[PDB]
Tab-separated table of C-alpha atoms and ligand atoms in Angstrom:
chain	number	residue	atom	x	y	z
A	1	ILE	CA	24.397	17.787	2.612
A	2	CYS	CA	20.514	17.729	2.763
A	3	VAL	CA	20.444	15.205	5.655
A	4	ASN	CA	22.413	17.779	7.796
A	5	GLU	CA	20.345	20.851	8.938
A	6	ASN	CA	18.200	20.569	5.715
A	7	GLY	CA	21.365	21.509	3.681
A	8	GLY	CA	20.833	25.076	4.953
A	9	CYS	CA	17.590	25.262	2.840
A	10	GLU	CA	14.545	27.125	4.149
A	11	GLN	CA	12.220	24.592	2.433
A	12	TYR	CA	13.222	21.710	0.062
A	13	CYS	CA	16.722	20.303	-0.500
A	14	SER	CA	18.108	18.145	-3.355
A	15	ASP	CA	21.576	16.438	-3.250
A	16	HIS	CA	23.599	16.411	-6.496
A	17	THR	CA	26.849	14.808	-7.879
A	18	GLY	CA	29.593	15.792	-5.402
A	19	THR	CA	29.269	18.457	-2.661
A	20	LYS	CA	26.518	20.040	-4.885
A	21	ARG	CA	23.169	21.030	-3.285
A	22	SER	CA	20.069	22.715	-4.747
A	23	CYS	CA	17.404	24.289	-2.479
A	24	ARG	CA	13.863	24.449	-3.789
A	25	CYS	CA	10.515	25.923	-2.728
A	26	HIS	CA	6.836	24.831	-2.625
A	27	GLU	CA	4.625	26.294	-5.434
A	28	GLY	CA	3.692	29.919	-4.711
A	29	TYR	CA	7.313	30.678	-3.609
A	30	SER	CA	10.617	31.611	-5.424
A	31	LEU	CA	14.197	30.930	-4.314
A	32	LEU	CA	16.295	34.010	-3.474
A	33	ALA	CA	19.854	34.639	-4.876
A	34	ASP	CA	21.264	33.344	-1.522
A	35	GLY	CA	20.080	29.971	-2.914
A	36	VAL	CA	18.428	28.992	0.421
A	37	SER	CA	15.551	31.446	1.115
A	38	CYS	CA	12.004	31.125	-0.178
A	39	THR	CA	9.884	34.199	-0.828
A	40	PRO	CA	6.084	34.194	-1.585
A	41	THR	CA	5.086	34.916	-5.198
A	42	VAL	CA	1.297	34.868	-4.504
A	43	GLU	CA	-1.069	36.718	-2.189
A	44	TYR	CA	-1.925	33.570	-0.142
A	45	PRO	CA	1.082	31.215	-0.060
A	46	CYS	CA	0.583	27.905	1.760
A	47	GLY	CA	1.547	27.628	5.449
A	48	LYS	CA	1.470	31.389	6.198
A	49	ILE	CA	-1.151	33.085	8.392
A	50	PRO	CA	-2.311	36.382	6.810
A	51	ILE	CA	-3.556	38.019	10.045
A	52	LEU	CA	-0.154	37.279	11.683
A	53	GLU	CA	1.880	38.146	8.480
A	54	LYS	CA	0.107	41.558	7.990
A	55	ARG	CA	0.559	42.351	11.738
B	1	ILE	CA	-9.417	19.047	21.773
B	2	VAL	CA	-8.702	18.533	25.516
B	3	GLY	CA	-6.556	21.085	27.389
B	4	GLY	CA	-5.962	23.488	24.517
B	5	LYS	CA	-7.337	26.939	23.808
B	6	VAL	CA	-9.563	28.680	21.238
B	7	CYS	CA	-7.615	29.093	17.979
B	8	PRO	CA	-7.962	32.907	17.374
B	9	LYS	CA	-10.205	33.411	14.298
B	10	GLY	CA	-8.018	33.213	11.165
B	11	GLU	CA	-5.019	31.603	12.900
B	12	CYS	CA	-5.913	27.980	11.707
B	13	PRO	CA	-6.971	29.039	8.118
B	14	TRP	CA	-6.345	25.590	6.616
B	15	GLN	CA	-8.790	23.948	9.089
B	16	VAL	CA	-11.682	22.214	7.365
B	17	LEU	CA	-15.004	21.223	8.960
B	18	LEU	CA	-16.693	18.171	7.345
B	19	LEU	CA	-20.496	17.926	7.605
B	20	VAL	CA	-22.942	15.123	6.689
B	21	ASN	CA	-26.652	16.260	6.532
B	22	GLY	CA	-25.480	19.440	8.338
B	23	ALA	CA	-24.128	17.493	11.343
B	24	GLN	CA	-20.464	17.722	12.397
B	25	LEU	CA	-18.576	14.722	11.040
B	26	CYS	CA	-14.778	15.340	11.073
B	27	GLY	CA	-11.949	17.775	10.572
B	28	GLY	CA	-9.764	18.145	7.503
B	29	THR	CA	-6.839	20.128	6.098
B	30	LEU	CA	-6.942	22.276	2.977
B	31	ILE	CA	-3.672	21.740	0.987
B	32	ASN	CA	-4.554	23.876	-2.120
B	33	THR	CA	-7.819	25.402	-3.468
B	34	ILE	CA	-9.543	22.098	-4.430
B	35	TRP	CA	-7.952	19.387	-2.202
B	36	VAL	CA	-8.569	18.434	1.430
B	37	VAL	CA	-6.737	15.809	3.465
B	38	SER	CA	-8.795	13.999	6.125
B	39	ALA	CA	-8.960	10.518	7.826
B	40	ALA	CA	-10.362	7.467	5.982
B	41	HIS	CA	-12.251	6.293	9.147
B	42	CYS	CA	-14.445	9.518	8.901
B	43	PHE	CA	-16.246	7.772	6.014
B	44	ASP	CA	-16.825	4.148	7.282
B	45	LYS	CA	-20.540	4.789	8.077
B	46	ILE	CA	-21.452	7.195	5.239
B	47	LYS	CA	-24.470	6.184	3.063
B	48	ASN	CA	-25.507	9.665	1.726
B	49	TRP	CA	-22.223	10.525	-0.167
B	50	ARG	CA	-24.041	13.454	-1.903
B	51	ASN	CA	-24.782	15.134	1.507
B	52	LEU	CA	-21.057	15.570	2.385
B	53	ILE	CA	-19.934	19.219	2.783
B	54	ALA	CA	-16.536	20.827	3.476
B	55	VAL	CA	-16.579	24.204	5.250
B	56	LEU	CA	-13.494	26.532	5.059
B	57	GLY	CA	-13.012	29.745	7.044
B	58	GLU	CA	-15.127	28.313	9.881
B	59	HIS	CA	-14.451	29.431	13.450
B	60	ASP	CA	-17.661	29.632	15.532
B	61	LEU	CA	-20.425	27.068	14.894
B	62	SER	CA	-23.155	29.221	16.495
B	63	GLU	CA	-22.928	32.148	14.043
B	64	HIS	CA	-22.460	32.866	10.321
B	65	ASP	CA	-19.972	35.775	9.950
B	66	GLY	CA	-19.533	35.703	6.146
B	67	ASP	CA	-15.978	34.216	6.076
B	68	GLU	CA	-17.292	30.604	5.830
B	69	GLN	CA	-17.106	28.903	2.431
B	70	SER	CA	-19.076	25.650	1.834
B	71	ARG	CA	-18.275	23.207	-0.940
B	72	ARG	CA	-19.719	19.851	-1.912
B	73	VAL	CA	-17.190	16.998	-1.759
B	74	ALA	CA	-16.976	15.567	-5.314
B	75	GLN	CA	-14.604	12.698	-4.459
B	76	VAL	CA	-13.325	10.800	-1.413
B	77	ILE	CA	-10.114	8.849	-2.199
B	78	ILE	CA	-8.992	6.151	0.227
B	79	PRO	CA	-5.861	3.927	-0.096
B	80	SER	CA	-6.573	0.272	-1.054
B	81	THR	CA	-4.678	-0.840	2.082
B	82	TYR	CA	-7.120	0.878	4.463
B	83	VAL	CA	-9.636	-1.616	5.954
B	84	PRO	CA	-12.867	-0.101	7.467
B	85	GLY	CA	-13.036	-0.535	11.266
B	86	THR	CA	-9.205	-0.921	11.603
B	87	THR	CA	-6.475	1.702	12.344
B	88	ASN	CA	-3.794	1.402	9.614
B	89	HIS	CA	-3.559	3.753	6.564
B	90	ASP	CA	-6.000	6.293	8.069
B	91	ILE	CA	-6.024	8.921	5.330
B	92	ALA	CA	-8.516	10.255	2.799
B	93	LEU	CA	-7.984	12.722	-0.019
B	94	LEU	CA	-11.039	14.843	-0.877
B	95	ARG	CA	-11.671	16.738	-4.085
B	96	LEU	CA	-14.001	19.755	-3.701
B	97	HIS	CA	-16.677	20.208	-6.406
B	98	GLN	CA	-15.542	23.841	-6.904
B	99	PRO	CA	-12.341	25.499	-5.570
B	100	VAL	CA	-12.484	27.572	-2.397
B	101	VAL	CA	-11.440	31.246	-2.772
B	102	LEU	CA	-8.218	32.011	-0.837
B	103	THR	CA	-8.705	34.922	1.623
B	104	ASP	CA	-7.214	35.979	5.003
B	105	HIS	CA	-9.457	33.289	6.567
B	106	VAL	CA	-8.980	30.467	4.029
B	107	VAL	CA	-5.374	29.444	3.301
B	108	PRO	CA	-3.913	25.995	2.441
B	109	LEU	CA	-1.348	24.257	4.666
B	110	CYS	CA	1.795	23.172	2.753
B	111	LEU	CA	1.874	19.479	1.889
B	112	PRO	CA	5.675	18.940	2.286
B	113	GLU	CA	7.982	16.794	0.124
B	114	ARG	CA	8.616	13.339	1.652
B	115	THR	CA	12.416	13.807	2.180
B	116	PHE	CA	12.006	17.195	3.835
B	117	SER	CA	9.177	15.739	6.037
B	118	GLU	CA	11.156	12.617	7.066
B	119	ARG	CA	14.589	14.229	7.595
B	120	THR	CA	13.558	17.615	8.976
B	121	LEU	CA	9.889	17.988	9.992
B	122	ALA	CA	9.836	14.639	11.841
B	123	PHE	CA	12.437	16.141	14.293
B	124	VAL	CA	10.494	19.360	15.091
B	125	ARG	CA	9.316	18.444	18.643
B	126	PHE	CA	6.033	20.409	18.903
B	127	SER	CA	3.174	20.732	16.420
B	128	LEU	CA	-0.400	22.019	16.547
B	129	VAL	CA	-3.529	19.811	16.453
B	130	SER	CA	-6.935	21.389	16.027
B	131	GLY	CA	-10.703	20.824	15.758
B	132	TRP	CA	-14.253	21.229	17.093
B	133	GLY	CA	-14.051	17.885	18.953
B	134	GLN	CA	-14.751	17.010	22.597
B	135	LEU	CA	-13.454	19.434	25.225
B	136	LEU	CA	-13.305	16.478	27.657
B	137	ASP	CA	-13.462	12.722	27.309
B	138	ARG	CA	-17.266	11.849	27.421
B	139	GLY	CA	-17.896	15.633	27.289
B	140	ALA	CA	-19.483	18.136	24.873
B	141	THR	CA	-17.803	19.234	21.574
B	142	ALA	CA	-16.464	22.827	21.105
B	143	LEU	CA	-18.473	25.683	19.458
B	144	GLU	CA	-15.242	27.586	18.651
B	145	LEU	CA	-12.217	26.033	16.927
B	146	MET	CA	-9.660	24.746	19.441
B	147	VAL	CA	-5.892	24.258	19.098
B	148	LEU	CA	-3.323	22.343	21.140
B	149	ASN	CA	0.514	22.208	20.989
B	150	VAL	CA	1.693	18.559	21.323
B	151	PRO	CA	5.209	17.008	21.347
B	152	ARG	CA	5.958	14.122	18.938
B	153	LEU	CA	7.516	10.908	20.240
B	154	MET	CA	9.545	8.162	18.594
B	155	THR	CA	7.360	5.002	18.420
B	156	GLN	CA	9.802	2.990	20.667
B	157	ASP	CA	9.415	5.783	23.317
B	158	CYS	CA	5.608	5.851	22.830
B	159	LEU	CA	5.277	2.069	23.459
B	160	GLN	CA	7.613	2.147	26.541
B	161	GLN	CA	5.818	5.256	28.012
B	162	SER	CA	2.335	3.727	27.453
B	163	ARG	CA	0.148	1.715	29.862
B	164	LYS	CA	-0.030	-1.840	28.390
B	165	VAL	CA	-3.762	-2.163	27.482
B	166	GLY	CA	-5.124	-5.489	26.121
B	167	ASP	CA	-6.231	-5.937	22.439
B	168	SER	CA	-4.643	-2.435	21.714
B	169	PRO	CA	-3.932	-1.767	17.994
B	170	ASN	CA	-0.281	-1.769	16.861
B	171	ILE	CA	1.446	1.551	16.130
B	172	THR	CA	2.674	0.975	12.525
B	173	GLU	CA	5.178	2.930	10.339
B	174	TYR	CA	2.061	4.744	8.895
B	175	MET	CA	1.419	6.313	12.347
B	176	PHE	CA	3.127	8.339	15.076
B	177	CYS	CA	2.392	9.268	18.690
B	178	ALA	CA	2.067	12.819	19.904
B	179	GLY	CA	0.813	14.340	23.112
B	180	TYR	CA	1.004	13.760	26.892
B	181	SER	CA	0.563	10.684	29.129
B	182	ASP	CA	-0.615	12.694	32.225
B	183	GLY	CA	-4.278	12.869	31.030
B	184	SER	CA	-4.372	16.665	30.589
B	185	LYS	CA	-3.965	17.361	26.830
B	186	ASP	CA	-4.976	15.477	23.663
B	187	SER	CA	-7.015	15.593	20.449
B	188	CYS	CA	-10.344	13.639	20.598
B	189	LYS	CA	-12.600	11.498	18.366
B	190	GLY	CA	-14.547	14.580	17.123
B	191	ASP	CA	-11.195	16.080	15.980
B	192	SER	CA	-10.582	12.993	13.721
B	193	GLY	CA	-9.242	13.992	10.281
B	194	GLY	CA	-7.954	17.356	11.516
B	195	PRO	CA	-4.392	18.683	10.974
B	196	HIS	CA	-1.241	17.991	12.959
B	197	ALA	CA	0.674	21.065	11.604
B	198	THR	CA	4.474	21.661	12.028
B	199	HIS	CA	6.281	25.000	11.915
B	200	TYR	CA	9.660	25.194	10.178
B	201	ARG	CA	11.540	28.419	9.365
B	202	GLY	CA	8.419	30.649	9.170
B	203	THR	CA	6.150	28.153	7.310
B	204	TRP	CA	3.608	25.540	8.472
B	205	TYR	CA	3.364	22.016	6.962
B	206	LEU	CA	1.032	19.013	7.160
B	207	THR	CA	2.729	16.165	9.137
B	208	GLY	CA	-0.157	14.273	10.706
B	209	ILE	CA	-3.883	13.586	10.738
B	210	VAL	CA	-5.933	13.102	14.001
B	211	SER	CA	-6.535	9.327	13.771
B	212	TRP	CA	-6.950	7.371	17.013
B	213	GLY	CA	-6.154	6.796	20.689
B	214	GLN	CA	-7.446	5.073	23.876
B	215	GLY	CA	-10.254	7.407	24.970
B	216	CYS	CA	-9.341	11.150	25.039
B	217	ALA	CA	-6.481	12.449	27.270
B	218	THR	CA	-6.351	9.026	29.105
B	219	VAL	CA	-3.510	8.705	31.693
B	220	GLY	CA	-0.801	6.410	30.299
B	221	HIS	CA	-1.817	7.162	26.677
B	222	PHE	CA	-0.909	9.458	23.753
B	223	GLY	CA	-2.744	10.562	20.619
B	224	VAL	CA	-1.989	8.522	17.464
B	225	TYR	CA	-1.720	10.383	14.123
B	226	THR	CA	-1.445	9.224	10.497
B	227	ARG	CA	2.165	9.741	9.329
B	228	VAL	CA	1.465	11.909	6.276
B	229	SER	CA	5.129	11.659	4.975
B	230	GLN	CA	4.318	8.029	3.891
B	231	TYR	CA	1.534	9.298	1.563
B	232	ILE	CA	3.154	12.286	-0.235
B	233	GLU	CA	3.741	10.495	-3.594
B	234	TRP	CA	0.316	8.735	-3.333
B	235	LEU	CA	-1.355	12.177	-2.717
B	236	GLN	CA	0.661	13.969	-5.470
B	237	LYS	CA	-0.172	11.356	-8.121
B	238	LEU	CA	-3.918	11.536	-7.282
B	239	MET	CA	-3.989	15.380	-7.373
B	240	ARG	CA	-2.643	15.219	-10.984
B	241	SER	CA	-5.365	12.707	-12.043
B	242	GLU	CA	-8.671	13.350	-13.767
B	243	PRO	CA	-11.859	13.067	-11.623
B	244	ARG	CA	-13.757	9.714	-11.981
B	245	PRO	CA	-17.581	9.232	-11.741
B	246	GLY	CA	-18.836	8.332	-8.225
B	247	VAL	CA	-17.840	9.944	-4.894
B	248	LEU	CA	-15.871	7.084	-3.279
B	249	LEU	CA	-12.650	5.937	-4.956
B	250	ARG	CA	-10.258	3.286	-3.631
B	251	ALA	CA	-6.787	3.912	-5.070
B	252	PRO	CA	-3.835	1.516	-4.959
B	253	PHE	CA	-1.325	2.100	-2.200
B	254	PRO	CA	1.693	2.405	-2.683
C	1	4JY	C1	-8.664	4.502	12.408
C	1	4JY	C2	-9.466	5.058	13.477
C	1	4JY	O1	-9.365	4.186	14.605
C	1	4JY	C3	-10.033	4.533	15.760
C	1	4JY	C4	-9.848	3.629	16.797
C	1	4JY	C5	-10.298	3.953	18.069
C	1	4JY	O2	-10.040	3.222	19.208
C	1	4JY	C6	-9.003	2.190	19.223
C	1	4JY	C7	-8.376	2.125	20.582
C	1	4JY	C8	-9.707	0.924	18.860
C	1	4JY	C9	-10.993	5.136	18.250
C	1	4JY	F1	-11.526	5.399	19.459
C	1	4JY	C10	-11.218	6.044	17.225
C	1	4JY	C11	-11.908	7.380	17.496
C	1	4JY	N1	-11.020	8.484	17.146
C	1	4JY	C12	-10.080	9.043	18.013
C	1	4JY	C13	-9.254	10.083	17.589
C	1	4JY	C14	-8.285	10.597	18.437
C	1	4JY	C15	-8.115	10.082	19.722
C	1	4JY	C16	-7.084	10.642	20.638
C	1	4JY	N2	-7.125	10.283	21.941
C	1	4JY	N3	-6.165	11.381	20.121
C	1	4JY	C17	-8.955	9.054	20.136
C	1	4JY	C18	-9.928	8.545	19.300
C	1	4JY	C19	-13.163	7.383	16.677
C	1	4JY	N4	-13.521	8.330	15.828
C	1	4JY	C20	-14.714	7.903	15.287
C	1	4JY	C21	-15.330	8.664	14.190
C	1	4JY	C22	-14.997	9.998	13.985
C	1	4JY	C23	-15.637	10.735	13.007
C	1	4JY	C24	-16.525	10.131	12.148
C	1	4JY	C25	-16.806	8.788	12.287
C	1	4JY	C26	-16.228	8.057	13.314
C	1	4JY	C27	-15.040	6.683	15.807
C	1	4JY	N5	-14.064	6.376	16.706
C	1	4JY	C28	-10.720	5.721	15.964
C	2	CA	CA1	-19.408	30.433	11.803
């Protein structure tokens, strides 16, 4: 699943036994209940531009 | 950077400026509050290891605006496979003596997982390359941080689209080509060590390091970047390790 369109994950993807897939996030983010989206948990998460984010 | 534009202040917040005795040395990429990724070749001619400074939140070299944060570089980690004066394995991992403070102007770039970088990021066509390097080949360096959007090429396509120059170094699996062959846009030697940053679903990641090329924006040639995906596990293991006395450290690769 992960090899195809990142398994639908916004960030990291792990393949499991069968058609099972777990999305994951970089530190400073949490996975949403959709199981694909990553939301920041810190004021300055990596790879985001504050002046553009706050705009 | 040749043929780019000024990166608006705060829009390249992971950009690092490396200084030796206050003189511009190289670029770098902040990946968390204490670690910087740069190019190993930046350090081939260093003698005064204690005079090496990393500057975060830098934008304009002619003025101090208060957003700049300077830190001494406590450690420079180079893979054992890197040979000074050669092109392969061009990566260095730097530990800052004290963490930088994250602010609107100082933010780390995400170091991606290897699988995500190889299967997804490697297929994003365009990425940004940045630095205070030469504005032209054999020209002056920039006072304001510059940024350029470059397309990535498969190595087979890079070699077929390139002008066959004698004694040219091989493009290994630890490198990738990005840029243009028309001589209008490229990163330059003074941008060495700087980020090649890739956007994916609202987040930016580290995919490359400004490494080498034939001149700067030379017709028939592309920029060559260190393929960061090959070093993820090597970087992660070192970031979890205790500091060791002495600035330079050669660490086994793989
Ligand atoms: C492993 C490095 O291998 C190198 C091999 C080179 O030439 C081959 C063809 C043999 C070469 F020109 C370089 C220069 N870098 C550079 C970077 C980007 C481009 C580009 N067009 N995108 C072109 C050239 C350079 N950077 C420095 C440098 C930079 C800071 C502190 C200390 C030294 C010295 N030289 C590096
Ligand atoms: Ca400044």
